[PDB]
């Protein structure tokens, strides 16, 4: 039986290939990316605070050309902090159910908690509606402060709208899927946390770009 000998030998070989497949720390790339996002986020937050302080002294000495610019800077800083802290709270509520070790990225692959709070059945739960509303209101109020795709920050506003979208997106096959269902449904916890921390890095980048065009 040249076939049974093969099976009796090679089922162990295929179990070994599967064990090597499972032993790849592919999902730890999300965790390493998240660590880098956090670090770059404190770095960019410190840069933003330094720019805010700089503008503070600039209009304290010269409240003639850009005092209202500093007022707008404070308002965007507060709105950005509110959105950042909302995302931070969502990130904490999902980082509290991975285990005692917050650096064991290989087990943060369940996705069950986050899709049980953002949406029930086929539509949004009224706290997952809150996430989408927060994204949309951040985008809208920021665009109002800067000016929508015209006047000033016109290119930046267009960059902002491409970041914090909520428009329904069509997948490869062609069905039209809602934004929050596309972006966070079925994603492992560490992938969702990495995406949220990236969404915070866009908040920091957006505000540092805003203060960049204020000197």
């Amino acid at each position: 039986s040249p076939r049974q000998k093969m099976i009796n030998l090679m089922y162990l070989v295929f179990i070994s290939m599967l064990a090597l497949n499972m032993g790849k720390e592919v999902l730890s790339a999300f965790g390493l990316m998240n660590e880098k996002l956090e670090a770059s986020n404190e770095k960019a937050n410190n840069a933003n605070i330094n720019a805010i302080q700089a503008l503070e002294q600039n209009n304290a000495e010269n409240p003639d050309q850009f005092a209202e610019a500093f007022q707008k800077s404070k308002k965007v800083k507060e709105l950005s902090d509110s959105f950042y802290n909302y995302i931070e709270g969502i990130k904490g509520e999902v980082m509290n159910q991975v285990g005692e070790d917050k650096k064991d990225y290989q087990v943060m692959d369940k996705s069950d908690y986050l899709d049980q709070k953002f949406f029930v059945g086929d539509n949004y739960k009224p706290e997952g509606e809150e996430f989408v509303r927060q994204i949309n209101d951040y985008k809208t109020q920021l665009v109002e402060l800067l000016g929508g795709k015209e006047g000033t920050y016109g290119e930046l506003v267009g960059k902002i709208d491409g970041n914090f979208n909520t428009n329904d997106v069509v997948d490869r096959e062609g069905v039209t899927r809602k934004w929050l269902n596309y972006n966070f449904e079925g994603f492992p916890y560490i992938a969702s946390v990495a995406k949220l921390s990236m969404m915070q890095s866009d908040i920091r980048a957006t505000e540092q770009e805003v203060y960049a065009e204020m000197l």
């Binding site: 040249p2 076939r3 093969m6 070989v13 290939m17």
Partner: protein
């Protein structure tokens, strides 16, 4: 008399699938024609062979 054509198919398919597993595990490259044939492509060829052997194992004494 047809038990010797199944033995040939069984043995040759076993060799092909084992060699495909070998080249997939060790990232080897055999160069005999066309492309470099990789080890992933050889795993795919071993899977084609294993599917054929599974099919022809349904109809045997």
């Amino acid at each position: 008399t047809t038990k010797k054509i199944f033995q040939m198919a069984y043995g040759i398919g076993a060799s092909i699938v084992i060699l495909g597993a070998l080249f997939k595990i060790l990232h080897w490259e055999i160069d005999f024609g066309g492309f470099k044939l990789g080890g992933g492509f050889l795993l795919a060829f071993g899977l084609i062979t294993e599917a054929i052997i599974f099919f022809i194992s349904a109809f045997e004494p």
